[PDB]
Structure formats: structure tokens, C-alpha cells
Nucleic acid binder design. Structure first.
Ligand SMILES: Nc1ncnc2c1ncn2[C@@H]1O[C@H](COP(=O)(O)OP(=O)(O)NP(=O)(O)O)[C@@H](O)[C@H]1O
Ligand SMILES: [Cl-]
Ligand SMILES: [Mn+2]
Length: 451
RNA sequence: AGACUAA
């Protein structure tokens, strides 16, 4: 038994048995990351198990380090510093980092125990990782624990909380507002506001600041400076992307959740391509995770979740289910077997088993395009599978007439590293590389041969 | 779009 936030002395021996995959589906704020996890890691260390701990984001990694501080853990995330003797038998890294390692030249340690926090995360690397882990368990090579308040097959957007939550449906602004949204700025406590993009966040964040509100903006771009400020440190609003959707302990009073998101979609009608669809409603799991950021303190009983609209459970057109198979078809176990997707995540797309496996140089290029080229999984797969070498950018100019990329209604031109002027007209279209002007800027550098 | 950045 346990008290006071401290990890339990008593840990179920069952969870360490090879072939055991344990699902810990406790509600948000139950203590998965900060109470249960450290008790498991302590017991793993006693059992001398080579252990891997996986966090979906640096926000979750940061939470874990708070819980695990003082224990012999090798942190393999920029979110955390620093040990490090090299003799640690416990590693901690992000979901996507692990999948990167699996696809790379370096081999992963043979972990006896794998702990995946937020094991519902629909990022394609996280899905592919779950495939690998459940295969390692099934083969009897490891024991694994999947922790999440919203396991796959979750439908309930309003789960149990530590403290009562007042759920309120209201219209929520997507852009700056002049008037008519007084409930936003009249609230006295601390608010966490989820935004679908950094750009949307910027606009909302500056609009709050002209009211004298202290606003902290959180995303992949500002995490390093700004996350400690959510901890130290008094503020009014956190305007955040989904970087904060899981695991965050903001000690806040209110969540504002427009329940909207853009979604990449693979289009099959005509030449295959990726578009950015929406904004569309979020999934029930995302809604529940976002809501879960409040009602976390039983001593604080008046927390609010302000949301707009219903969630949309059907995300079978989201490119992530295909992109997960593209990654997993190119991952192996030392015994030779290509992993299959974790059970509840099978047949989200229609197969085909091994359809995406790449041979020889094609696999290395595939990985390079993602890691060095910063290209999406789908686009990297398309280029690699065409037998194109990483440095060969001819494909950026040889697309059909319809594939010409426009910016401010003008045909995008590229000056190559050799000094040719060519119209940007890629053989494959993925909106993720051209929709946002910052993404387009990076894709232009790629096309130029400067990446 | 959002997330990741390892040996
Ligand atoms: N630094 C802190 N100070 C006070 N309370 C905290 C702190 N960190 C966490 N808590 C509380 O400890 C409880 C357990 O937190 P945690 O282990 O993050 O829960 P969890 O089950 O992982 N939640 P989630 O990730 O939302 O599914 C919650 O009630 C938190 O509000
Ligand atoms: Cl909290
Ligand atoms: Mn957690």
C-alpha cells in the first residue's frame, strides 16, 4: 500500500512476466505517470530488467523526470538533462525516437520490460512502436505495460476525474475577437486553451495579451523555454497545441477546447495524394485527454471544461493508419519477423500485409527522407519506393501540370544549388509540405538541394 | 497540421 503521492512498496509480480502485456487504463490524474510508473521502475531495477520507458511528447517526458528523479535512468530526450554514466539499465525516450532507432543503423537494446505511457497516441510512429512491442511480448522476449486513460476503442469524452468538473458547451473563437466573448477574460483562474496550430495559437495569445492577461504559449517550438514557466511561476493562460494534450499537470482551473483539428488524408480518387482536411472534430480520446488536464485536484472543486461541438470517433481516413504500416513494414525483430500492429489497431486500413516493405537502399533512403529531409512518412515512402536516391531532387520538378505549387497565387520557382531556375512541381503531392508557409519554406530548401 | 530529434 501507499500514501502521499509516493509509489507503492508493493508491485504485482505478474506485470514482469514475459508474454504479459498489461493495460493500465486508469482515469486521468489517477497516478499512472507519477505514482505507478516509479513503483514499476524501482521494482524493474531490483529484478535487473533492461527497461525502456516511452513518453509521447517532451511534456510527458518532463512529468516522468519529476517522478523518477534520483533513479539511475538514461534520458534520451532533449527535454531532460543530465546524468550519465552509460551503465544505466533503464532508458527513457519519446515514442517517435524509439521508432526512429528501430528504423536506423543502430540496434536497440534487448529490453526485457517496455513501459509505454499514453499507449493510445495515434501518431504513426507511436502506432508502429506498439506493433513492435506487442510482437516482442507475443514472441516471449519481453513484458510490456501500456498506460492510458483512453485505450483504443475509447468512446467516452467525459471520464472520471479526481475532482468534479463542470462541463460547459459554448461557442469558442478560432481567431481574434473584438467583442462578445467576455466569459473568456472575466474568468478569475488559470486557463489551458488548446489550439489546432501554432499560428492559430499566436493570434489567440496576442488577443489575450491586449487585455493584460499573462499568456504562455506552448508547442514544439517553444517547449524548452516555456514549459518551466508553466511550473515556477504564475500565469493566466496557457495557449497550447496538442503537445500538452496528454499527461500535463498544469494546476489549472479551466480548459477551453474547441475540439477541432486538421487531419492529413490520403486521397485515392485519381493520382494518390495527401491533403489537409478540416478543421474536423477531434476524437473522443483527444476530447477526454484535453478535459483531463483539469479536475485533477480533489481540494479544488470548481474546475471547468468549456468545449464546442461533438467529437468524431471515425478517423479511418487519417493518413496515420497507413503511415504506421509504412514504418512497421520496415521494422524487424532480431529473429527475423516483421511486427504486426497491436491488436485493437488492426484493419483500420485495408492491409495488405507487407505491402510497404522496402529493399536495400530504398529503406535507407526512406529513413533519410524523414530524418534529414524532414518529409512526411507518406511522401518519403513514395520517393524511396520509386528507387530515387536521397540527394536526387529531380522528382520535385517532374510532376504533372496540376502539381505546380502556388504561393500568394504565383507559381513557386526554385533556384537550385547548381543555379537552375525551376518551377516547383513535385511528382507526389503532400499538402503537409506546402500548405503552411513555414513548411513550404522548408520544402523549397529541400527542392533547392540545401537540405 | 500536430508530434519526435536518438546511438
Ligand atoms: N507537481 C505536482 N504537485 C502537486 N500535485 C501533482 C504534481 N504532479 C502531479 N500531481 C497530481 O498527482 C495526481 C497524479 O498525477 P499523474 O501521475 O500525472 O496522473 P496520470 O494518471 O498519469 N494522469 P493522465 O496522464 O492525465 O492520464 C494528479 O492528481 C495530479 O494533479
Ligand atoms: Cl494538475
Ligand atoms: Mn500521465
Amino acid at each position: 500500500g501507499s500514501a502521499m503521492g509516493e509509489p507503492d512498496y508493493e508491485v504485482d509480480e505478474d506485470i514482469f512476466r514475459k508474454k504479459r502485456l498489461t493495460i493500465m487504463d486508469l482515469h486521468p490524474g489517477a497516478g499512472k505517470t507519477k505514482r505507478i510508473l516509479p513503483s514499476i521502475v524501482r521494482e524493474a531495477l531490483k529484478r535487473r530488467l533492461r527497461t525502456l520507458i516511452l513518453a509521447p511528447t517532451r511534456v510527458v517526458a518532463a512529468e516522468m523526470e519529476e517522478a523518477l528523479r534520483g533513479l539511475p535512468i538514461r534520458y534520451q530526450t532533449p527535454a531532460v538533462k543530465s546524468d550519465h554514466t552509460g551503465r544505466e539499465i533503464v532508458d527513457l525516450m519519446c515514442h517517435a525516437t524509439f521508432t526512429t532507432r528501430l528504423l536506423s543503423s543502430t540496434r536497440v537494446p534487448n529490453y526485457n520490460l517496455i513501459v509505454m505511457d499514453e499507449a493510445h497516441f495515434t501518431d504513426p510512429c507511436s502506432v508502429a512502436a506498439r506493433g513492435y512491442i506487442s510482437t516482442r511480448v507475443e514472441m516471449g522476449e519481453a513484458a510490456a505495460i501500456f498506460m492510458t486513460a483512453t485505450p483504443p476503442g475509447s468512446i467516452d469524452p467525459f471520464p472520471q476525474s479526481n475532482s468534479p468538473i463542470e462541463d460547459i458547451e459554448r461557442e469558442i473563437p478560432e481567431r481574434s475577437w473584438n467583442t462578445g466573448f467576455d466569459w473568456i477574460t472575466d474568468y478569475q483562474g488559470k486557463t489551458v486553451w488548446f489550439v489546432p496550430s501554432i499560428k492559430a495559437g499566436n493570434d489567440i495569445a496576442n488577443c489575450l495579451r491586449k487585455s493584460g492577461k499573462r499568456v504562455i504559449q506552448l508547442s514544439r517550438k517553444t517547449f524548452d523555454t516555456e514549459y518551466p514557466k508553466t511550473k515556477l511561476t504564475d500565469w493566466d493562460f496557457v495557449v497550447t497545441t496538442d503537445i500538452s494534450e496528454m499527461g500535463a499537470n498544469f494546476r489549472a482551473g479551466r480548459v477551453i477546447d474547441p475540439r477541432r483539428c486538421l487531419k492529413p488524408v490520403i486521397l485515392t480518387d485519381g493520382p494518390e495524394r495527401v491533403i489537409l482536411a478540416g478543421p474536423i472534430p477531434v476524437t473522443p480520446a483527444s476530447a477526454a485527454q484535453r478535459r483531463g488536464r483539469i479536475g485533477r485536484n480533489p481540494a479544488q472543486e470548481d474546475d471547468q471544461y468549456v468545449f464546442s461541438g461533438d467529437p468524431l470517433k471515425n478517423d479511418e481516413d487519417h493518413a496515420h493508419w497507413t503511415e504506421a504500416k509504412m514504418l512497421l513494414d520496415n521494422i524487424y525483430t532480431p529473429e527475423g519477423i516483421i511486427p504486426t500492429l497491436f491488436g485493437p489497431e488492426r484493419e483500420k486500413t485495408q492491409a495488405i500485409d507487407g505491402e510497404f516493405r522496402l529493399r536495400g537502399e530504398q529503406r535507407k533512403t526512406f529513413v533519410e527522407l524523414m530524418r534529414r529531409g524532414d518529409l512526411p512518412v507518406w511522401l518519403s515512402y513514395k520517393v524511396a519506393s520509386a528507387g530515387i536516391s536521397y540527394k536526387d531532387r529531380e522528382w520535385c520538378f517532374t510532376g504533372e501540370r496540376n502539381n505546380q505549387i502556388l504561393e500568394e497565387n504565383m507559381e513557386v520557382e526554385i533556384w537550385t544549388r547548381e543555379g537552375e531556375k525551376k518551377k516547383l512541381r513535385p511528382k507526389w503531392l503532400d499538402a503537409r509540405v506546402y500548405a503552411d508557409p513555414m513548411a513550404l519554406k522548408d520544402f523549397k530548401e529541400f527542392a533547392s538541394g540545401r537540405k
